[PDB]
Design an enzyme around this catalytic site. Structure first.
Site, PDB file in Angstrom:
ATOM      1  N   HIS A   1       0.821  -1.202   0.000  1.00 17.97           N
ATOM      2  CA  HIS A   1       0.000   0.000   0.000  1.00 17.97           C
ATOM      3  C   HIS A   1       0.858   1.257   0.000  1.00 17.97           C
ATOM      4  O   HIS A   1       0.604   2.166  -0.781  1.00 17.97           O
ATOM      5  CB  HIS A   1      -0.964  -0.011   1.187  1.00 17.97           C
ATOM      6  CG  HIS A   1      -1.823  -1.236   1.236  1.00 17.97           C
ATOM      7  ND1 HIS A   1      -2.791  -1.501   0.288  1.00 17.97           N
ATOM      8  CD2 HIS A   1      -1.904  -2.216   2.149  1.00 17.97           C
ATOM      9  CE1 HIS A   1      -3.411  -2.613   0.599  1.00 17.97           C
ATOM     10  NE2 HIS A   1      -2.896  -3.069   1.743  1.00 17.97           N
TER      11      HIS A   1
ATOM     12  N   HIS B   1       5.107   6.906   7.158  1.00 19.80           N
ATOM     13  CA  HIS B   1       4.895   6.431   5.803  1.00 19.80           C
ATOM     14  C   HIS B   1       4.542   7.638   4.955  1.00 19.80           C
ATOM     15  O   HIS B   1       4.343   8.750   5.473  1.00 19.80           O
ATOM     16  CB  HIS B   1       3.839   5.299   5.768  1.00 19.80           C
ATOM     17  CG  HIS B   1       2.520   5.886   6.163  1.00 19.80           C
ATOM     18  ND1 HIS B   1       2.067   5.839   7.483  1.00 19.80           N
ATOM     19  CD2 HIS B   1       1.594   6.431   5.375  1.00 19.80           C
ATOM     20  CE1 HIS B   1       0.863   6.471   7.483  1.00 19.80           C
ATOM     21  NE2 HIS B   1       0.627   6.943   6.173  1.00 19.80           N
TER      22      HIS B   1
ATOM     23  N   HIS C   1       2.231   9.159   1.260  1.00 21.34           N
ATOM     24  CA  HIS C   1       1.287   9.009   0.178  1.00 21.34           C
ATOM     25  C   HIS C   1       1.785   9.893  -0.952  1.00 21.34           C
ATOM     26  O   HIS C   1       2.249  11.007  -0.694  1.00 21.34           O
ATOM     27  CB  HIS C   1      -0.130   9.474   0.622  1.00 21.34           C
ATOM     28  CG  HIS C   1      -0.633   8.755   1.828  1.00 21.34           C
ATOM     29  ND1 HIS C   1      -1.351   7.565   1.766  1.00 21.34           N
ATOM     30  CD2 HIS C   1      -0.419   9.016   3.132  1.00 21.34           C
ATOM     31  CE1 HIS C   1      -1.586   7.142   3.024  1.00 21.34           C
ATOM     32  NE2 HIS C   1      -1.075   8.033   3.877  1.00 21.34           N
TER      33      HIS C   1
ATOM     34  N   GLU D   1      -3.013  13.784   0.638  1.00 16.34           N
ATOM     35  CA  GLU D   1      -4.374  13.410   1.055  1.00 16.34           C
ATOM     36  C   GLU D   1      -5.108  14.647   1.555  1.00 16.34           C
ATOM     37  O   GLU D   1      -6.202  14.972   1.075  1.00 16.34           O
ATOM     38  CB  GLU D   1      -4.253  12.408   2.200  1.00 16.34           C
ATOM     39  CG  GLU D   1      -3.557  11.117   1.760  1.00 16.34           C
ATOM     40  CD  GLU D   1      -3.900   9.835   2.501  1.00 16.34           C
ATOM     41  OE1 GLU D   1      -3.760   9.818   3.722  1.00 16.34           O
ATOM     42  OE2 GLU D   1      -4.342   8.876   1.853  1.00 16.34           O
TER      43      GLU D   1
ATOM     44  N   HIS E   1       3.191  11.077   6.864  1.00 18.70           N
ATOM     45  CA  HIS E   1       2.439  10.822   8.076  1.00 18.70           C
ATOM     46  C   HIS E   1       3.333  10.173   9.127  1.00 18.70           C
ATOM     47  O   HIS E   1       3.822   9.063   8.899  1.00 18.70           O
ATOM     48  CB  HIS E   1       1.245   9.919   7.784  1.00 18.70           C
ATOM     49  CG  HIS E   1       0.212  10.644   6.980  1.00 18.70           C
ATOM     50  ND1 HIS E   1      -0.771   9.985   6.237  1.00 18.70           N
ATOM     51  CD2 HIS E   1       0.029  11.970   6.761  1.00 18.70           C
ATOM     52  CE1 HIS E   1      -1.523  10.899   5.653  1.00 18.70           C
ATOM     53  NE2 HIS E   1      -1.090  12.098   5.975  1.00 18.70           N
TER      54      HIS E   1
ATOM     55  N   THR F   1      -6.613   7.054   7.249  1.00 22.01           N
ATOM     56  CA  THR F   1      -6.995   7.259   5.849  1.00 22.01           C
ATOM     57  C   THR F   1      -6.866   5.989   5.004  1.00 22.01           C
ATOM     58  O   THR F   1      -7.131   6.037   3.809  1.00 22.01           O
ATOM     59  CB  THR F   1      -6.202   8.380   5.192  1.00 22.01           C
ATOM     60  OG1 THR F   1      -4.851   7.926   5.052  1.00 22.01           O
ATOM     61  CG2 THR F   1      -6.226   9.655   5.993  1.00 22.01           C
TER      62      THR F   1
HETATM   63  N1  LIG Z   1      -2.847   7.587   6.398  1.00 23.43           N
HETATM   64  S1  LIG Z   1      -2.806   6.734   7.990  1.00 23.43           S
HETATM   65  O1  LIG Z   1      -1.879   7.413   9.020  1.00 23.43           O
HETATM   66  O2  LIG Z   1      -4.246   6.811   8.543  1.00 23.43           O
HETATM   67  C1  LIG Z   1      -2.094   5.057   7.682  1.00 23.43           C
HETATM   68  C2  LIG Z   1      -1.679   4.659   6.417  1.00 23.43           C
HETATM   69  F1  LIG Z   1      -1.882   5.401   5.313  1.00 23.43           F
HETATM   70  C3  LIG Z   1      -1.046   3.446   6.222  1.00 23.43           C
HETATM   71  F2  LIG Z   1      -0.692   3.115   4.948  1.00 23.43           F
HETATM   72  C4  LIG Z   1      -0.818   2.562   7.267  1.00 23.43           C
HETATM   73  S2  LIG Z   1       0.032   1.044   6.827  1.00 23.43           S
HETATM   74  O3  LIG Z   1       0.314   0.216   8.109  1.00 23.43           O
HETATM   75  O4  LIG Z   1       1.389   1.504   6.267  1.00 23.43           O
HETATM   76  C5  LIG Z   1      -0.753   0.008   5.562  1.00 23.43           C
HETATM   77  C6  LIG Z   1      -2.247   0.170   5.744  1.00 23.43           C
HETATM   78  O5  LIG Z   1      -2.492  -0.243   7.060  1.00 23.43           O
HETATM   79  C7  LIG Z   1      -1.192   2.911   8.565  1.00 23.43           C
HETATM   80  N2  LIG Z   1      -0.963   1.994   9.631  1.00 23.43           N
HETATM   81  C8  LIG Z   1      -1.939   1.703  10.727  1.00 23.43           C
HETATM   82  C9  LIG Z   1      -1.341   2.036  12.072  1.00 23.43           C
HETATM   83  C10 LIG Z   1       0.030   1.833  12.277  1.00 23.43           C
HETATM   84  C11 LIG Z   1       0.618   2.148  13.496  1.00 23.43           C
HETATM   85  C12 LIG Z   1      -0.197   2.661  14.528  1.00 23.43           C
HETATM   86  C13 LIG Z   1      -1.561   2.878  14.340  1.00 23.43           C
HETATM   87  C14 LIG Z   1      -2.152   2.555  13.103  1.00 23.43           C
HETATM   88  C15 LIG Z   1      -2.359   0.218  10.692  1.00 23.43           C
HETATM   89  O6  LIG Z   1      -1.215  -0.566  10.682  1.00 23.43           O
HETATM   90  C16 LIG Z   1      -3.306  -0.139  11.803  1.00 23.43           C
HETATM   91  C17 LIG Z   1      -4.697   0.064  11.618  1.00 23.43           C
HETATM   92  C18 LIG Z   1      -5.627  -0.240  12.634  1.00 23.43           C
HETATM   93  C19 LIG Z   1      -5.189  -0.711  13.865  1.00 23.43           C
HETATM   94  C20 LIG Z   1      -3.810  -0.924  14.066  1.00 23.43           C
HETATM   95  C21 LIG Z   1      -2.842  -0.646  13.040  1.00 23.43           C
HETATM   96  C22 LIG Z   1      -1.849   4.142   8.739  1.00 23.43           C
HETATM   97  F3  LIG Z   1      -2.217   4.515   9.982  1.00 23.43           F
HETATM   98 ZN   LIG Z   2      -1.054   8.010   5.889  1.00 20.92          ZN
END
Ligand SMILES: NS(=O)(=O)c1c(F)c(F)c(S(=O)(=O)CCO)c(N[C@H](c2ccccc2)[C@@H](O)c2ccccc2)c1F
Ligand SMILES: [Zn+2]
Length: 257
Positions: free
Chosen positions: A61, A91, A93, A103, A116, A195
């Site tokens: 992703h 990470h 986008h 975004e 982010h 997101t």
């Molecule tokens: N644009 S965003 O900040 O909203 C976003 C992203 F765009 C994103 F790509 C990710 S990701 O982990 O790189 C792959 C999609 O899960 C995460 N990761 C989540 C996460 C990681 C660390 C701590 C909290 C959340 C995901 O891994 C996740 C989702 C739900 C519950 C636990 C973790 C994410 F939060």
């Molecule tokens: Zn993000």
């Protein structure tokens, strides 16, 4: 599964994650003229001195750099936050071309990319539990425009050839995320969501006003990553951004002006 294409992209996400059409979804367009300056908001505290990066991975992703968040090492506090949030990962986008990729938007303006930095509230003990709480996460969002290079991003861009396809990862130590921040910590803040699926409404968004500039050669390296695993058809990892969602019953607050 979910992604960013025509058949599995953001307009489709609500089928598996109905909160996609919820009351506090992210990202949003930031209308600079109707954001409310809140003189009571504190300056943001970004304490990244003891950050310990560990690994970088392509998850099909985005790519993400994961930190040791087993102790208070790199934390965010203050601004609109109550308590202490620990950095767990960052990470990005980005777009297929320089005129899109972010975004959040600002007065409808799209940046080439958005960084982010994801943090979790230490009262919840871990990122998973934090994700289930309305004040679980704080994401610091930083816009990238294309121009001068950002020297502190170079260590990232130079390892991306090693994680070209989904599921590849590498050790990635001693990366300093301070080298990705702009000069100013002025910010907008609003309550929103992840997101990406599962789109949990658990995020306090802090979006910095000042973009960082990155060079064309830096962003071109992002666009060489693949969404696919090695040995599936090649689909470049580009346009991995969710578009602006309706603001609904929210006010964006500003730390400035
Ligand atoms: N644009 S965003 O900040 O909203 C976003 C992203 F765009 C994103 F790509 C990710 S990701 O982990 O790189 C792959 C999609 O899960 C995460 N990761 C989540 C996460 C990681 C660390 C701590 C909290 C959340 C995901 O891994 C996740 C989702 C739900 C519950 C636990 C973790 C994410 F939060
Ligand atoms: Zn993000």
């Amino acid at each position: 599964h979910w992604g960013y294409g025509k058949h599995n992209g953001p307009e489709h996400w609500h089928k598996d994650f109905p909160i996609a059409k919820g009351e506090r979804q992210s990202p949003v367009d930031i209308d600079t003229h109707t954001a409310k300056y809140d003189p009571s908001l504190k300056p943001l505290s970004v304490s990244y001195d003891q950050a310990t990066s560990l690994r970088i991975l392509n998850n099909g992703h985005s790519f993400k750099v994961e930190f040791d968040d087993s102790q208070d090492k790199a934390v965010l506090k203050g601004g609109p936050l109550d308590g202490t949030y620990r950095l767990t990962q960052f990470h990005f986008h980005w777009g297929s071309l320089d005129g899109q990729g972010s975004e959040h938007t600002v007065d409808k303006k799209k940046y080439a990319a958005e960084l982010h930095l994801v943090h979790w509230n230490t009262k919840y003990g871990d990122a998973g539990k934090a994700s289930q709480q309305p004040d679980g996460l704080a994401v610091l969002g930083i816009f990238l425009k294309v121009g001068s290079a950002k020297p502190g991003l170079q260590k990232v861009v130079d390892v991306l050839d090693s994680i070209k396809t989904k599921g590849k990862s590498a050790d990635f130590t001693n990366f300093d995320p301070r080298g990705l921040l702009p000069e100013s910590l002025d910010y907008w803040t609003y309550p929103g969501s992840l997101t990406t699926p599962p789109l949990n409404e658990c995020v306090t968004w802090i979006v910095l006003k000042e973009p960082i500039s990155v060079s064309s050669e830096q962003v071109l390296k992002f666009r060489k990553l693949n969404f696919n695993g090695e040995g599936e058809p090649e689909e470049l990892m580009v346009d991995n951004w969710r578009p602006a969602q309706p603001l609904k019953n929210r006010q964006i607050k500003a730390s400035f002006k």
